[PDB]
Design a protein around this ligand. Structure first.
Ligand SMILES: CCCCCCCC/C=C\CCCCCCCC(=O)OC[C@@H](O)COP(=O)(O)O
Ligand SMILES: CC(C)CCC[C@@H](C)[C@H]1CC[C@H]2[C@@H]3CC=C4C[C@@H](O)CC[C@]4(C)[C@H]3CC[C@]12C
Ligand SMILES: CC(C)CCC[C@@H](C)[C@H]1CC[C@H]2[C@@H]3CC=C4C[C@@H](O)CC[C@]4(C)[C@H]3CC[C@]12C
Ligand SMILES: CC(C)CCC[C@@H](C)[C@H]1CC[C@H]2[C@@H]3CC=C4C[C@@H](O)CC[C@]4(C)[C@H]3CC[C@]12C
Ligand SMILES: CCCCCCCCCCCCCCCC(=O)O
Lengths: 56, 228, 334, 128, 271
C-alpha cells in the first residue's frame, strides 16, 4: 500500500512546485496599505461616542 | 413587541428550570477497555457508522447512565477531553493475558492527564477463572515479563478466599499491587482507585458501582464542607 | 522501488525550499518599523448571558450583528437576542456530546454535530429536525454554510466533505491530511477555503474542483484554530506550542510570529478585527490577549472568566466581541 | 517541519551489542520527552523505553531491564540507545518518538495509524 | 432574705462596651469577605450571611444600654428602651435557630448523600431563613403591653406584672427557643460522629466537638438561670438561701450569651 501512497505524494509535490511567487516586500506593502485605507471604520480600534453605541 | 418577547422568554425559563431539576439527579459514567477484555459481557449483565452508545439502569431508585465509544480511530487525545466532569471512569482489564504492559501504560496515561486529574476510577480485573486455570496448568511463567515477581511473598495480613490455593493468591496480589503502585505514586489526594476481582458470571457489579459512587459523593461533600 | 520514490520526494522538497528562500529579501518587521503604535486598549463587559448548565463549546454570530446561537453539553442549543438579553429559542438535542454549531447567512437554518458523526440541520421559520447528514466515520469538528443548500464539514477521520442538502448526498470529498482536521474558514469570495489539522500543517482547497492548491508548515504541534485576513490574501493560525503565526498566500511562506516568554499554554481561538489591525486570541490561562498585527506587540488583555476559554467572535460591523468558556457563561465586550 | 532520523542497526550475533542514534530537527529539543518503540515481524507496535526532559527519569519494560540503556544530549539534539547481550527475540524495526505537547506529564498515542511525530525506523537482526 | 448585687451596674459596663469594639470589627470583616473575596455560592453561605447580619444588628443595640448602666438615667421615653430590649432578645434567639439550621444541613449532607439532593437547594434555604425571621420577630410583639416606667425601664417590676404577664412569655421562649434546638443539635452531631468511625480523620472530629461545646457552654447556663429566676420572682418557694443564690448568679451569667456574638465570626469562619 506504500507504493501508491509514495506515487501520490510525488505527484502532489510535482504539482505544488510549479507556481509563481512574489517578494515579501510587496506583500507587506499591500497589507499596510489595506490596513491604513480602512482605519476609520474600526470601532474596536478608535471607539465611538456613547450616543452611537447600541451596547451602552 | 416587547411584552410578547418577555412572555416567551419567561416560558422558556420555566421549561429550563424543569429540565435542570432532573439533570442534577442522574449519575454519568464512562466505560473503558480493550478488545480482549470482556467489556460487552459486563454491559450485558444489567437489567433496566454510529459513534457512541448509552445504557441506562437503576439501583435503589438511583439512575445511572453509562457511555461506551463506537466507531472512532486509534487517536484519543482530543475526544477524551469531553469527559472531564463525569462521576467516574470504569476501567476493565483482562488479567489472564502478555498484554499487561499496554494496560498499565493506558492506566498511567489516564491517571496523569491534566483535564482528568479530579476523576475517580473503578478498576475491574476480569477473567479470574482463566487465570486460575493458567496458573494451575504450570506451562507458563510470570517471571518472563515481571522479573521482580521472583522476590514477592504474600503478606501475612492477607485475607484469602476460603479454598483458593496459595499460588493463585500470590499471583492475584502481585497483579493488583502493580496497578495500586501507579495509583499511589503520583496521586493528588483528590481522587482514589477502587479495585475488584470479577468473572463473567458475577451478579454483584451493580452493587459495587453503587457503593463506590456513594463513597465518592460523600468525599466530595466532606471537601465542600471543609472537614477533610 | 519505495526508496526511489522517497528520494524523489526528497529532491522535490529541497527544490521547493530553495525556490521559497529565493524570494525572501526583507521582513515585515523591518518595513513597519516606522509607524505609530496603537497604544493601550481598554475594553469593558456590557452583558452576561446566563442559562446553560455545563461547558460551552461553540458560538456563531448572525449576519445582522444582533442574534446569537450557542451550544452546550447539557444537550442544548440556545438562540439569544443580544441587545435585550432575551431568549428567542431553546432546542433540545438527541445526543448531548455536541462540538460545533453554525448559523445560516439567510437566518433560516442552524446546524450542529459532535461525537455521533452526524450533522443535523434545523429549520427555524416554519422547530423540527429538518435533516440529518450521515457518512463520516469520525466525530464532526466543524461546519459552515455556503448557502441554503450547500454545507462544508470537517471530521476527525482526516477528510473534509461538501454536501448538497436537498438530495442529502455527499457531493465532494477533500483528502490529503494525515491527522484530525480541527478547523475551517471560508474565503470572502467563497471559492477557496483553508483547513488545519493535528499533523501541524495547513492546506488551501478549491471548492469547485476538489484539489489542494498549497501546503503551509512551520508550527511545532497541533493546530487548533484558523482565520482569514479581511483582504483574502493571508491567514493566521494558533497551536498548542503557545504561539500564533501569520502566513501569506502569494509569497507562499510564513510572515510573522506572535509569542511571549511567560506564555506556556495552548491557544484555542483566533479572530481579526474589522480593519485587520488587531488580532485577538483565547488562551488556556483563563483569559484573552489582544495583539498588534503589524508589529507583534501585546496591546491588551481581557480577563474575567473562571475556567478555560473555548470560543470567540467578532460582529460583521466590528462593534463588539463575544467570548464563551467552560464556566457556562457568555460575555460581551465593548 | 518536524524531522527525526535514526541510524545504527544491522545484523549481529547472539550476545552482541549495538548503539542506535537519533537526530532531531525542527523543534526545541529540550522541551519534550523521548521514547523508543519497536515492532516485530508479525506483531503490533510495542513500547520499549522512556526518558524525560532533563535526563533525571528513566523507564524500561520488564523484558529489557539490565541490558538496554537510554541517554540524551541536548546541546547536539541527539538521542541514544545502547543494547547489550542481544537475543534472537529482539529482531525488529526500531522507531523514535516524541510526545505531542511540551511541558506535560502524560504521553502520546502508540498507534499503527500515521502518528505524525515518529521516524522511519532501522532494522536490527540477531541470528547466526 | 437579703442580697447585694449592685456590682452588676459596673459588671455590664466594663464588658458590654468591650464587646462593642470587638464584634463591630469582626462581623464587618466577615461581611467584607462575603462581599467579594470568595465568589462561591451554596447553602452554608446563605446561613452564614444571615447569621452575620443578625449578629451585626445585635451589636448595634448595645450603646444605649451602656449609657443607661453608666448614667443610671433614661431621658428618652419608654419606647426607645422597649424597642432596644426587643431587638436584643430577637437577635439573640435568631442566632440559636440559625446555628441549628447549619447543623441539620451538615447531617443531611454527610449521612444521606443520595436521598437529599431533592431537599438541598438555595431556594429552600431562602424559604427557611424567611420563616425564621418571621417567627422570631412575630413573638416580640406582646412586649408592647408593658409599662416600663418605674427614670428607669425594665428594672424592678411590681409583683403584679410577674404574676400574670412575664412568666408566660418566659415559658414560651424557653419551650420553643432552647430545648428542641438542643436536642436536634446533639442528636445530629452524635450521628455524624458515629457514622465516620466505622471500619486523615483527625480534622473531622475536632470541628464537631468545638461547635457543640461552644453552643452548649454559651447558651445552657443563661436559660437555666432564667427559668429559676422566673420561679423565684413568681414566689413559689421561700428558701431564702436559694433565693439569694439565684438572684446573685443571674447578673454574672447573661454575659456569656452576649459574649457569644464575637465567637461566631472566629470559629465557624477561619477553618
Ligand atoms: C420563637 C421563640 C421566641 C423567640 C423570640 C423571643 C421574644 C422575646 C422578646 C421580648 C420578650 C421580652 C421578655 C423579657 C423576659 C424578662 C427578661 C429579664 O431577665 O428580666 C429580668 C429583669 O430585667 C427585670 O427586672 P426584676 O423585675 O428586678 O427582675
Ligand atoms: C425587623 C427588621 C428591623 C429586621 C431587619 C430585616 C433584615 C435585616 C433581614 C430580613 C430579610 C433578610 C434577607 C433574607 C434573604 C437574604 C438573601 C441572602 O442571600 C442574603 C441575605 C438576605 C438578603 C437577608 C438580609 C437580611 C434581611 C434583609
Ligand atoms: C420541628 C420540626 C419542623 C423539625 C424538623 C426536623 C427536620 C430537619 C427532619 C425531621 C423530618 C426529617 C426528614 C424525614 C424524612 C426523610 C426521609 C429519609 O429517608 C431521609 C431523611 C429525611 C429526608 C428527613 C430529613 C430531615 C427532616 C426533615
Ligand atoms: C420549634 C422550632 C423552633 C424548631 C425549628 C427547627 C429548625 C431549626 C429545623 C426544622 C426544619 C429544618 C430544615 C428542614 C430542611 C432543610 C433544608 C436544607 O436545605 C437545609 C436544612 C434545612 C433548612 C433544615 C434546617 C433546620 C430546620 C429549619
Ligand atoms: C419556628 C418556626 C420556624 C419555621 C422554619 C421553617 C418552617 C417552614 C419550612 C417550609 C419549607 C420546608 C420544606 C421545603 C419544601 C420544599 O422542598 O420546597
Amino acid at each position: 500500500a506504500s507504493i501508491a501512497q509514495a506515487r501520490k505524494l510525488v505527484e502532489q509535490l510535482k504539482m505544488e512546485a510549479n507556481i509563481d511567487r512574489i517578494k515579501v516586500s510587496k506583500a507587506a506593502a499591500d497589507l499596510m496599505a489595506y490596513c491604513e485605507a480602512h482605519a476609520k471604520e474600526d470601532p474596536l480600534l478608535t471607539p465611538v461616542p456613547a450616543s452611537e453605541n447600541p451596547f451602552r | 413587541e416587547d411584552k410578547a418577547a418577555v412572555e416567551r422568554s419567561k416560558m422558556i425559563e420555566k421549561q429550563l428550570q424543569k429540565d435542570k431539576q432532573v439533570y442534577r439527579r442522574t449519575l454519568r459514567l464512562l466505560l473503558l477497555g480493550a478488545d480482549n477484555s470482556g467489556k460487552s459481557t459486563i454491559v450485558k449483565q444489567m437489567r433496566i457508522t454510529s459513534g457512541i452508545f448509552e445504557t441506562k439502569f437503576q439501583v435503589d431508585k438511583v439512575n445511572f447512565h453509562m457511555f461506551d465509544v463506537g466507531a472512532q480511530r486509534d487517536e484519543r487525545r482530543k475526544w477524551i477531553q469531553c469527559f472531564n466532569d463525569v462521576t467516574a471512569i470504569i476501567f476493565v482489564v483482562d488479567s489472564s493475558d502478555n498484554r499487561l504492559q499496554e494496560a498499565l501504560n493506558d492506566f498511567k496515561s489516564i491517571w496523569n492527564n491534566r483535564w482528568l486529574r479530579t476523576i475517580s476510577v473503578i478498576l475491574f480485573l476480569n477473567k479470574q477463572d482463566l487465570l486460575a486455570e493458567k496458573v494451575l496448568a504450570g506451562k507458563s511463567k510470570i517471571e518472563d515479563y515481571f522479573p521482580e515477581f521472583a522476590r514477592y511473598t504474600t503478606p501475612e495480613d492477607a485475607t484469602p478466599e476460603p479454598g483458593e490455593d496459595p499460588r493463585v493468591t500470590r499471583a492475584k496480589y502481585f497483579i493488583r499491587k502493580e496497578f495500586v503502585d501507579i495509583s499511589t505514586a503520583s496521586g493528588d489526594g483528590r481522587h482514589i482507585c477502587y479495585p475488584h476481582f470479577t468473572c463473567s458470571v458475577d451478579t454483584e457489579n451493580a452493587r459495587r458501582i453503587f457503593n463506590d459512587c456513594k463513597d465518592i459523593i460523600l468525599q466530595m461533600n466532606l471537601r465542600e464542607y471543609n472537614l477533610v | 522501488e519505495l526508496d526511489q520514490l522517497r528520494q524523489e520526494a526528497e529532491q522535490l522538497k529541497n527544490q521547493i525550499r530553495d525556490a521559497r528562500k529565493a524570494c525572501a529579501d526583507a521582513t515585515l518587521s523591518q518595513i513597519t518599523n516606522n509607524i505609530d503604535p496603537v497604544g493601550r486598549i481598554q475594553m469593558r463587559t456590557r452583558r452576561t448571558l446566563r442559562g446553560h448548565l455545563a461547558k460551552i463549546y461553540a458560538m456563531h454570530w448572525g449576519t445582522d450583528s444582533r442574534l446569537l446561537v450557542s451550544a452546550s453539553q447539557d444537550g442544548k442549543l440556545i438562540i439569544w437576542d443580544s441587545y435585550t438579553t432575551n431568549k428567542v429559542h431553546a432546542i433540545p438535542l438527541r445526543s448531548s456530546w455536541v462540538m460545533t454549531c453554525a448559523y445560516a447567512p439567510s437566518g433560516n437554518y442552524v446546524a450542529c454535530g459532535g461525537l455521533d458523526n452526524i450533522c443535523s440541520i434545523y429549520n427555524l421559520k416554519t422547530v423540527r429536525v429538518s435533516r440529518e447528514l450521515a457518512g463520516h466515520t469520525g466525530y464532526l469538528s466543524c461546519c459552515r454554510f455556503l448557502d441554503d443548500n450547500q454545507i462544508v464539514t470537517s471530521s476527525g477521520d482526516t477528510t473534509c466533505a461538501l454536501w448538497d442538502i436537498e438530495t442529502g448526498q455527499q457531493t465532494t470529498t477533500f483528502t490529503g491530511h494525515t491527522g484530525d482536521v480541527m478547523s475551517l474558514s471560508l474565503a470572502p469570495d467563497t471559492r477557496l477555503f483553508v483547513s488545519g489539522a493535528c499533523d501541524a500543517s495547513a492546506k488551501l482547497w478549491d471548492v469547485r474542483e476538489g484539489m489542494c492548491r498549497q501546503t503551509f508548515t512551520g508550527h511545532e504541534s497541533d493546530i487548533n484554530a484558523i482565520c482569514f485576513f479581511p483582504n483574502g490574501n493571508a491567514f493566521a493560525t494558533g497551536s498548542d506550542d503557545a504561539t500564533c503565526r501569520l502566513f501569506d498566500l502569494r509569497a507562499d511562506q510564513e510572515l510573522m510570529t506572535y509569542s511571549h516568554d511567560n506564555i506556556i499554554c495552548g491557544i484555542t481561538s483566533v479572530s481579526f478585527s474589522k480593519s485587520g489591525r488587531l488580532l485577538l486570541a483565547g488562551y488556556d490561562d483563563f483569559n484573552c490577549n489582544v495583539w498588534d498585527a503589524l508589529k507583534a506587540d501585546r496591546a491588551g488583555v481581557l480577563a474575567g472568566h473562571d475556567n478555560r476559554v473555548s470560543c470567540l467572535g467578532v460582529t460583521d460591523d466590528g462593534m463588539a466581541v463575544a467570548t464563551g468558556s467552560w464556566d457556562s457563561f457568555l460575555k460581551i465586550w465593548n | 517541519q518536524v524531522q527525526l532520523q535514526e541510524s545504527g542497526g544491522g545484523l549481529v550475533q547472539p550476545g552482541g551489542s549495538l548503539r542506535l542514534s537519533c537526530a532531531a530537527s525542527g523543534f526545541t529539543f529540550s522541551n519534550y520527552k523521548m521514547n523508543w518503540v519497536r515492532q516485530a515481524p508479525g506483531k503490533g507496535l510495542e513500547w520499549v523505553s522512556d526518558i524525560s526532559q532533563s535526563g533525571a527519569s528513566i523507564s524500561y519494560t520488564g523484558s529489557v531491564k539490565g541490558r538496554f540503556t537510554i541517554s540524551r544530549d541536548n546541546a547536539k539534539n541527539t538521542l541514544y540507545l545502547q543494547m547489550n547481550s542481544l537475543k534472537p527475540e529482539d529482531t525488529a524495526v526500531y522507531y523514535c518518538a516524541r510526545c505531542p505537547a511540551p511541558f506535560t506529564r502524560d504521553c502520546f498515542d502508540v498507534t499503527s495509524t500515521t502518528y505524525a511525530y515518529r521516524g522511519q525506523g532501522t532494522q536490527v537482526t540477531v541470528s547466526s | 432574705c437579703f442580697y447585694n448585687d449592685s456590682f452588676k451596674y459596673t459588671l455590664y459596663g466594663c464588658m458590654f462596651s468591650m464587646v462593642f469594639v470587638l464584634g463591630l470589627i469582626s462581623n464587618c470583616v466577615a461581611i467584607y469577605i462575603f462581599a467579594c473575596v470568595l465568589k462561591v455560592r451554596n447553602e452554608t453561605t446563605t446561613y452564614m450571611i444571615n447569621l452575620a447580619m443578625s449578629d451585626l444588628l445585635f451589636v448595634f443595640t448595645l450603646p444605649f444600654r451602656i449609657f443607661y448602666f453608666t448614667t443610671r438615667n433614661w431621658p428618652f421615653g419608654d419606647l426607645l428602651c422597649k424597642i432596644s430590649v426587643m431587638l436584643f432578645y430577637t437577635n439573640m434567639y435568631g442566632s440559636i435557630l440559625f446555628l441549628t439550621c447549619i447543623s441539620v444541613d451538615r447531617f443531611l449532607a454527610i449521612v444521606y448523600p443520595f436521598k437529599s439532593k431533592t431537599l438541598r437547594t438555595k431556594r429552600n434555604a431562602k424559604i427557611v431563613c424567611t420563616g425564621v425571621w418571621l417567627t422570631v420577630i412575630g413573638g416580640s410583639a406582646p412586649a408592647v403591653f408593658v409599662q416600663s416606667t418605674h427614670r428607669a425601664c425594665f428594672e424592678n417590676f411590681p409583683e403584679a406584672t410577674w404574676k400574670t404577664y412575664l412568666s408566660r412569655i418566659v415559658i414560651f421562649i424557653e419551650i420553643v427557643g432552647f430545648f428542641i434546638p438542643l436536642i436536634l443539635n446533639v442528636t445530629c452531631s452524635s450521628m455524624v460522629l458515629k457514622t465516620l468511625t466505622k471500619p486523615n480523620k483527625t480534622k473531622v472530629l475536632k470541628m464537631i466537638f468545638v461547635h457543640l461545646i461552644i453552643f452548649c457552654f454559651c447558651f445552657v447556663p443563661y436559660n437555666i438561670n432564667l427559668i429559676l429566676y422566673s420561679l423565684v420572682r413568681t414566689q413559689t418557694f421561700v428558701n431564702c438561701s436559694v433565693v439569694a443564690a439565684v438572684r446573685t448568679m443571674y447578673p454574672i451569667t447573661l454575659c456569656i450569651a452576649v459574649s457569644n456574638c464575637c465567637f461566631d465570626p472566629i470559629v465557624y469562619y477561619f477553618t
